[PDB]
Amino acid sequence: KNILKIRRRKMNHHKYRKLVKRTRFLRRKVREGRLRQKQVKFERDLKRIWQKAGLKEAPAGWQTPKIYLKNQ
Amino acid sequence: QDDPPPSMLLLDYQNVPGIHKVDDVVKRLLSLEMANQKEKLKIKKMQLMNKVLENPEDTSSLEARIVALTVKIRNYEEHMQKHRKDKAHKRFLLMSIDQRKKMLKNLRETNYAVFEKICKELGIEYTFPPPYHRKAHRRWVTKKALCTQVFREVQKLKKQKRALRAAAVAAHKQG
Amino acid sequence: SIARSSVHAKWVVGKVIGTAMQKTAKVRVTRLVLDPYLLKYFNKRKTYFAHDALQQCTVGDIVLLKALPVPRTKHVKHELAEIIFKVGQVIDPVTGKPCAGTTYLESPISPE
Amino acid sequence: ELMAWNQAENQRLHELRLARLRQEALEQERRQAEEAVLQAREAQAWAQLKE
RNA sequence: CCAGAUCUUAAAGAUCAAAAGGAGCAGGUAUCAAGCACACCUAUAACGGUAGCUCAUAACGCCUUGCUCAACCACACCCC
Ligand SMILES: [Mg+2]
Ligand SMILES: [Mg+2]
Ligand SMILES: [Mg+2]
Ligand SMILES: [Mg+2]
Ligand SMILES: [Mg+2]
Ligand SMILES: [Mg+2]
């Protein structure tokens, strides 16, 4: 009655979980990539700031930590 | 930390006549010695409400409620120091703290003299809520730290450039 | 006799938001605006910086602002005229007596 | 004219109010008598029990 | 709120009104949520000093776009 709706979702979810199992290391690769990208855009955002403020180098003792690439 | 002495003769039996004439043993059974913890809280409450307040008779007054709630809060503090993982009492503590503070912000808006006094006496410190509660996360925390360092650099450099300007123009103007 | 300000705001009344800058009160002013669809009135808020000469202002005080003839800065167009309700110390304008909330702190019928 | 009129009006109301509050003060002292009686009775009862 | 231009006349007026402002109103998108110096004082106009300012009543972005029409706003080959 209502289960028809549930059943549908049920199927969808199953099929998707299955797929994540197959596609797993492909997915790993893509997410690691996106994390690198993220870190980079972040660095650019920072660099952009200290440059538009007229400074040449980043301020003394600034290492710009790696937040997204944080070890799992 | 205060110390409502072991021999202190519980709240209800303090004002009954000729108590001090009784022999050591009964005096001892009516002591905070043989007492519960709840009796030490009654005592602590009376004592605080006498040190801090003006009219200890009014239970109704905001100030009175703040004092009482503060006794309860210090008590949950103790309990929580012993039991780290009790989440139920952690709830009581945080909650009851928010109630205290709500009442404080209500004093400050109505009778300020008293509010001032209470904060001094119970050692409570009243902070205004921030505007904008937002979760400070890794990206924002880092970026802000950077922006602050950048700022401090820049204005320091403008200061050095003005020192150079002043020195140059002065040593020029003299000869 | 020319002293004016081009502002619409010649007199306003508002709460003191924060005192953090030297000699300058941040003040939240609030007006009623009629939401056209619902025909109802809601409070739009707007902030004003005001010049406080003696730094008289706690946060939470209701206060009255007069428009400054010559703007002190780009953001400061008003000077603080009066303190209408000091925060949590309020003297009833009707009976001239100290009150905390709805209670009289010193009764007006006990002069002596 | 109108500001003066308003002034006199506020003063009128002020006197009315002072009357009302004196009255309330009286009724209040009456209440204090009642409460003092009851609290005295229960003070006694408590003293007896504890004794 | 008006500097300025112009007309008239001695002046005063008057027409068009740049710049500067703000009671209020003003496209979509919050999967754009933080912006990163964006404030104030001092006083002499500088030296100096406080550490602020904007923002979930939508800041800061991105997309789309002439308009609320006795009219108004903008452009004038391109690089605002
Ligand atoms: Mg399906
Ligand atoms: Mg003119
Ligand atoms: Mg104009
Ligand atoms: Mg177009
Ligand atoms: Mg062009
Ligand atoms: Mg062409």
Automatic annotation (TrEMBL), chain A:
It comes from the Eukaryota. It is found in: Mitochondrion. Mg(2+) binds at residue 12. Belongs to the mitochondrion-specific ribosomal protein mS38 family. This is Small ribosomal subunit protein mS38. The lineage of its organism: Eukaryota, Metazoa, Chordata, Craniata, Vertebrata.
TrEMBL record, chain B:
It is found in: Mitochondrion. This is Small ribosomal subunit protein uS15m. The chain holds residues 65 to 266 of 266 of the full protein. Belongs to the universal ribosomal protein uS15 family. The keyword Phosphoprotein does not apply. One of its GO terms (cellular component) is mitochondrial small ribosomal subunit. It comes from Sus scrofa. GO terms for biological process: translation. The keyword Transferase does not apply. Keywords: Coiled coil, Mitochondrion, Ribonucleoprotein, Ribosomal protein, Transit peptide.
UniProtKB/TrEMBL annotation, chain C:
GO terms for molecular function: rRNA binding; structural constituent of ribosome. One of its GO terms (cellular component) is mitochondrial inner membrane. It is found in: Mitochondrion. InterPro entries: NA-bd_OB-fold, Ribosomal_uS17, Ribosomal_uS17m_metazoa. GO terms for biological process: translation. Pfam families: Ribosomal_S17. Keywords: Mitochondrion, Ribonucleoprotein, Ribosomal protein, RNA-binding, rRNA-binding. Its main location: mitochondrion. Belongs to the universal ribosomal protein uS17 family. This is Small ribosomal subunit protein uS17m. It comes from Sus scrofa.
